[PDB]
Every structure is written in structure tokens, then in C-alpha cells.
Write a structure and sequence with these properties.
With 238 residues, this protein is of the alpha/beta class. It has two domains: 137 residues, D-Maltodextrin-Binding Protein, domain 2 (3-Layer(aba) Sandwich); 101 residues, 3-Layer(aba) Sandwich (D-Maltodextrin-Binding Protein, domain 2). Helices cover 39% and strands 17% of the residues. The protein has a three-stranded parallel β-sheet with strand order 4-1-5, sandwiched between helices. It has a three-stranded parallel β-sheet with strand order 9-8-10, with helices on both faces. The radius of gyration is 19 Å and the shape is elongated. It is classed as transport protein.
């Protein structure tokens, strides 16, 4: 028998990713997924505010039944707990201006300047991945600073996620001025397959479901359909 009620901990921090209604209602892209799952699981879903750093402890304190946030999933993390409801693939994407023709390849990247966001696997990984390749990389401490450089042409391209890029980049007039270099490259191991919900292994039955429900969404293209609606990109590409 499945749980009578499911407690989810979601703390909106990125409008594009989530948000809150002044009417007291809760809205967000990740929320819509949970609802669809709630029906499939045939149970009640309750959202509780709480920061990631608190989500992990809360899960241990049995305070929450599941964790739903931007938190990325990784093999190393899987060894600790169980993950599912995978939202989207968080690989990488290249953003360049139509003026400069750049294709998904380290070669064409050689001699080109690339900007990255400090405090990430890209910079650290790049410092070695794109280091011996003879590629110049710059780390920034501002998210908007990176886009500003791109719009200025100070950077030949930036390694960002597809969903995050389109969700914001394209979702903003900035993308209109420039938008090219879809699929790029990057180690998926750093961020795993992408992002998902943090569940405990004991969730043998729940995991079996959520996973089953996810497969159904793919069969009916519910996931892909929603993605195409929210934004025009490729989930597979990540």
C-alpha cells in the first residue's frame, strides 16, 4: 500500500524554475511534474518551503517524504540515496552569434574565448578538459555578467545547460539578438544524467512507480510535449 500523503520540500528561488502565487497557491515547472506524478501514484502531495541545505537534513529527519528542487543528480549521489522523476538532461550548450560560425567541436573552439560561471564543475573540469586543448577559459562571478559579455561579443561561446539556457537565454530578448550552437559537449558524469528528485533507497515501491510513471510520460510524449510548450529545445541533447 502506498503512502496516504506525500510530503515534498520545494523552495522556489528561480522564477523560471519555480515561483509563488500571491493568492497562496504554488506554481512552477517542477510543481507541474509532481502533480502529474501525484495522480499516477494516486496519493496526496504537499509542498513545504525549505532550502536545499535543509532538504537533505529534513529527509533524514523524516520531516519530508521527497525532495524536489534544482538539485542535480549524480552517480555518487545515487550511492547515498535514490533518484528519479528526472526532470531534464543538464549537459551543456554553446551560445554564439550568427556572425561567428561555430560548430560543436573542440577544434573550432581552439583560439576562441569561452566564459564560465565560477564555482562550478565546468571551470574546474575545464581547467583540465579545455586546458590541454589550447582553449582560453574565463570564470565569472556573475550570472548576468556572462550573458552581458556574450551580447557584447567578449566571449566566443559559453558552456551552459540547454534547459537553463532556453528557459532564460531565449526566454529573454537577449536570445533574439543571438542564439546558435545548440548541442555542444561536456562530461555528464559531473552533473550526472541531469536533475531529478532525491528519494531514499527504501523507496523500492515508490521508486518503481515514479519511474513507471516517468516511462509513461515518455510514451505519451507528455514530458517532451510539455518541454516543447515551455521552450523549444532538445531534452535528449540536455
Amino acid at each position: 500500500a502506498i503512502p496516504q500523503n506525500i510530503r515534498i520540500g520545494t523552495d522556489p528561488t528561480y522564477a523560471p524554475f519555480e515561483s509563488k502565487n500571491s493568492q497562496g497557491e504554488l506554481v512552477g515547472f517542477d510543481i507541474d511534474l509532481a502533480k502529474e506524478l501525484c495522480k499516477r501514484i494516486n496519493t496526496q502531495c504537499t509542498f513545504v518551503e525549505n532550502p536545499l541545505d535543509a532538504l537533505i537534513p529534513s529527509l533524514k529527519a523524516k520531516k519530508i517524504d521527497a525532495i524536489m528542487s534544482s538539485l542535480s543528480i549524480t552517480e555518487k549521489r545515487q550511492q547515498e540515496i535514490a533518484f528519479t522523476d528526472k526532470l531534464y538532461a543538464a549537459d551543456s550548450r554553446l551560445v554564439v552569434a550568427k556572425n561567428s560560425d561555430i560548430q560543436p567541436t573542440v577544434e573550432s573552439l581552439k583560439g576562441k574565448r569561452v566564459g564560465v560561471l565560477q564555482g562550478t564543475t565546468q571551470e574546474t573540469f575545464g581547467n583540465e578538459h579545455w586546458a590541454p586543448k589550447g582553449i582560453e577559459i574565463v570564470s565569472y562571478q556573475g550570472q548576468d555578467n556572462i550573458y552581458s559579455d556574450l551580447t557584447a561579443g567578449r566571449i566566443d561561446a559559453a558552456f551552459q545547460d540547454e534547459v537553463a539556457a532556453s528557459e532564460g537565454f531565449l526566454k529573454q530578448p537577449v536570445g533574439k539578438d543571438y542564439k546558435f550552437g545548440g548541442p555542444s559537449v561536456k562530461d555528464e558524469k559531473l552533473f550526472g544524467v541531469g536533475t531529478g528528485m532525491g528519494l531514499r533507497k527504501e523507496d523500492n515501491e515508490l521508486r518503481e512507480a515514479l519511474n513507471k510513471a516517468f516511462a509513461e510520460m515518455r510514451a505519451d510524449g507528455t514530458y517532451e510535449k510539455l518541454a516543447k510548450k515551455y521552450f523549444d529545445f532538445d531534452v535528449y541533447g540536455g
